[PDB]
UniProtKB/TrEMBL annotation:
It holds the Pfam family YceI. The keyword Membrane does not apply. InterPro entries: Lipid/polyisoprenoid-bd_YceI, TTHA0802/YceI-like_sf. This is Periplasmic protein. SUPFAM superfamilies: YceI-like (SSF101874). Keywords: Signal. The gene is yceI. It comes from Campylobacter jejuni. The keyword Signal applies. Residues 3-168 form the Lipid/polyisoprenoid-binding YceI-like domain.
Length: 171
């Protein structure tokens, strides 16, 4: 034989090991419309109807938003918009209430509950009405047979909705 010493400069004592990481995908939608009927005298919603243009999804990541439109997610070509229709608002007090409505995603419709939290009701600077409130709720992918080809392991079955609204009076 013969004896050698390592060139530490061009020697790597290396290893690769695979692991998993859980993170939240957070997203919103840039293009939606809503109709809002609300009574500041009683803190009650009368009508809340929302249409969201699926195409305008934004999860902060270009190629994911594209992929979201595909046949194995939103199927945007066939079902371009998702919709919420309030059916009933059960007031708890002037800050909180339970909202029940129909959510439709890719042509499957289901009745859901959102927790309404009224952030603020005012007459503005100019003397016209404003309101600020939030709706939230967990819905289940499985209940809307949504993205069924993706496992509930890879992607959580639960979607948490956070609707944050500031809104002013009309006409």
């Amino acid at each position: 034989m013969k004896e050698y010493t390592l060139d530490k400069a061009h020697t790597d004592v290396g290893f690769k090991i695979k692991h998993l990481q859980i993170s939240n995908v957070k997203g919103n939608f840039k293009d939606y419309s809503a109709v809002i009927d609300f009574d500041p005298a009683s803190a009650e919603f009368k009508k809340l109807d929302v249409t969201i243009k699926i195409a305008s999804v934004n999860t902060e990541n270009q190629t994911r938003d594209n992929h979201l439109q595909q046949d194995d997610f939103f199927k945007a070509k066939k079902y371009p918009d998702m919709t919420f229709t309030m059916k009933k608002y059960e007031k708890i007090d002037n800050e909180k209430g339970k909202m029940t409505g129909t959510l439709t995603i890719a042509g499957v419709s289901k009745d859901i509950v959102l927790d309404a939290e009224i952030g603020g009701v005012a007459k503005g600077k100019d003397g016209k009405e404003k309101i600020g409130f939030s709706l939230n709720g967990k819905i289940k992918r499985s209940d809307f047979k949504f993205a069924t080809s993706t496992s509930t392991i890879t992607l959580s079955d639960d979607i948490n909705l956070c609707i944050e609204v500031e809104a002013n009076e009309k006409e």
